[PDB]
Amino acid sequence: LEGESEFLFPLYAKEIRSRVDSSLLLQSTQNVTVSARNSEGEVTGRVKVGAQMVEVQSQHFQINSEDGKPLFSAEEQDVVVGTGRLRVTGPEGALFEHSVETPLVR
Amino acid sequence: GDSEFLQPLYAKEIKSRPGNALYFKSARNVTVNILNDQTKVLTQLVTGPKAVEAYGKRFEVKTVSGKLLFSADDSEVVVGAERLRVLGAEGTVFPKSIETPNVRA
Amino acid sequence: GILEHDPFFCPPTEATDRDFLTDALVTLLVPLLVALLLTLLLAYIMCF
Amino acid sequence: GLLRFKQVSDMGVIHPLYKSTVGGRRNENLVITGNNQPIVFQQGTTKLSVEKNKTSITSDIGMQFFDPRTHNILFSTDYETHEFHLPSGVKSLNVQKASTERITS
Ligand SMILES: *[C@@H]1O[C@H](CO)[C@@H](O[C@@H]2O[C@H](CO)[C@@H](O[C@@H]3O[C@H](CO)[C@@H](O)[C@H](O)[C@@H]3O)[C@H](O)[C@H]2NC(C)=O)[C@H](O)[C@H]1NC(C)=O
Ligand SMILES: *[C@@H]1O[C@H](CO)[C@@H](O[C@@H]2O[C@H](CO)[C@@H](O[C@@H]3O[C@H](CO)[C@@H](O)[C@H](O)[C@@H]3O)[C@H](O)[C@H]2NC(C)=O)[C@H](O)[C@H]1NC(C)=O
Numbered sequence: 001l002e003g004e005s006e007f008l009f010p011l012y013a014k015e016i017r018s019r020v021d022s023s024l025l026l027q028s029t030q031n032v033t034v035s036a037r038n039s040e041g042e043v044t045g046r047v048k049v050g051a052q053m054v055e056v057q058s059q060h061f062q063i064n065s066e067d068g069k070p071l072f073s074a075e076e077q078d079v080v081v082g083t084g085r086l087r088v089t090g091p092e093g094a095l096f097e098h099s100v101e102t103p104l105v106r
Numbered sequence: 107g108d109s110e111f112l113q114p115l116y117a118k119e120i121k122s123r124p125g126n127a128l129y130f131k132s133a134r135n136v137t138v139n140i141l142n143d144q145t146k147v148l149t150q151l152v153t154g155p156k157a158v159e160a161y162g163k164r165f166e167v168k169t170v171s172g173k174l175l176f177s178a179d180d181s182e183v184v185v186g187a188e189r190l191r192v193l194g195a196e197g198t199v200f201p202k203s204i205e206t207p208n209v210r211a
Numbered sequence: 212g213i214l215e216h217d218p219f220f221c222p223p224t225e226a227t228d229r230d231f232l233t234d235a236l237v238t239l240l241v242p243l244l245v246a247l248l249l250t251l252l253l254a255y256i257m258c259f
Numbered sequence: 260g261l262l263r264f265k266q267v268s269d270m271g272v273i274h275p276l277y278k279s280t281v282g283g284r285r286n287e288n289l290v291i292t293g294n295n296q297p298i299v300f301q302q303g304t305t306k307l308s309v310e311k312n313k314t315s316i317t318s319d320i321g322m323q324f325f326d327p328r329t330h331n332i333l334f335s336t337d338y339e340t341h342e343f344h345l346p347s348g349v350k351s352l353n354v355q356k357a358s359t360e361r362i363t364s
């Protein structure tokens with residue numbers, strides 16, 4: 001093609017790709033919604049690039065390494081940090097309550 | 107009318123008209139990949155029916171001006187909270203260590 | 212754990228290609244028969 | 260009234276208008292791939308860019324994740340409204356100032 005291409009009614013593509021020389025740039029004005037369906041054809045998890053915040057609505061959010069090692073995971077049970085290190089950059093710092101048990105202070 | 111592509115579509119920019127939302131749907135999954143010259147997957151996002159999993163080398167969140175509110179890379183997990191509060195009653199255990207330049211009762 | 216119902220996402224089914232053989236046979240047999248009748252007519256009143 | 264493309268299609272710029280939601284085929288998947296180029300969502304100023312290596316999000320507030328089953332915000336980046344609770348599994352901590360009360364081995 002050379003120019004625009006209007007589209008009415010849904011578009012049942014197989015695998016959208018992007019040009020080699022340019023970056024694919026999806027756009028909207030209200031929101032951008034990405035959904036998924038279970039075996040019953042019902043929406044269960046969905047991400048939404050909204051007006052000001054990106055809302056992820058699902059049952060188990062997870063961030064992994066490139067190989068596949070877990071790095072972060074938030075679910076209904078409790079948040080888990082798998083990298084074995086945390087770092088808070090706030091000037092006020094941590095505010096503990098009773099005691100801290102560590103074998104090394106650096 | 108309805109259109110079905112049996113081959114990889116190519117596009118440059120999928121815009122949406124003003125006042126009209128843009129929707130992406132599927133029946134099993136929505137996977138967003140990135141390929142190199144040799145075409146191996148480098149960064150990948152999977153919006154599963156129940157799990158939303160991000161892959162790659164570094165995931166970050168920043169404001170429009172630029173400020174790391176969250177970043178979970180391989181080494182450490184940086185959090186931009188101005189003040190972290192621990193409400194444990196019997197105390198907390200850190201197996202490895204702490205790294206502070208100031209301790210103040 | 213259900214957010215939307217959207218009873219509009221209907222992917223196209225396993226719709227096989229329409230059989231072009233029958234219509235192609237019809238639109239090839241009609242001119243073939245016309246040409247055969249023409250050849251017979253040419254033989255008839257050209258050789259008599 | 261259903262067109263069925265059967266070859267590599269280069270539609271250039273696509274302009275969805277009405278009742279047109281990009282969807283995957285019948286019950287297999289919906290894979291979006293960028294050939295050595297970032298995949299950038301957009302809405303006004305809010306972004307979601309899957310580049311090489313990194314996976315960036317830009318917004319005035321930040322990402323927020325809540326379970327649809329109970330509608331409670333499990334993890335928000337709006338730290339002022341939603342305080343940050345220490346996630347389990349941390350071996351070491353790196354804070355700017357620790358206002359503890361007693362340190363024990
Ligand atoms: C993403 O943005 C779109 C458009 O801004 C949102 O769609 C809108 O959803 C509202 C909520 O239902 C619709 O309002 C009402 O819809 C009913 C449907 O029958 C209609 O009868 C009412 O008169 C009223 O319009 C609104 O029409 C609809 N807009 C469009 C263009 O479809 C969508 O909800 C947003 N998604 C998220 C997750 O926020
Ligand atoms: C659609 O997306 C979902 C979510 O990403 C995929 O489900 C997940 O698929 C992975 C890969 O098979 C599963 O990991 C596996 O875990 C087992 C242990 O249970 C392990 O032995 C395997 O080696 C592998 O690591 C993961 O459990 C699974 N999550 C579920 C089912 O909740 C699904 O496969 C995707 N489907 C398609 C067609 O792409």
Ligand SMILES: *[C@@H]1O[C@H](CO)[C@@H](O[C@@H]2O[C@H](CO)[C@@H](O)[C@H](O)[C@H]2NC(C)=O)[C@H](O)[C@H]1NC(C)=O
Nearest residue numbers: 142148149163164166309310311312313314315
């Ligand atoms: C993502 O990875 C690529 C590849 O390592 C980085 O590209 C490098 O960019 C720097 C500065 O822009 C150059 O000096 C290097 O030569 C580039 N490397 C290659 C192999 O071309 C890219 O910077 C990374 N992205 C981020 C945000 O760090």
Ligand SMILES: *[C@@H]1O[C@H](CO)[C@@H](O)[C@H](O)[C@H]1NC(C)=O
Nearest residue numbers: 222223224225226227285286
């Ligand atoms: C697809 O539609 C055709 C209509 O000719 C129907 O015969 C077929 O069963 C449908 N396939 C599925 C999987 O529903």
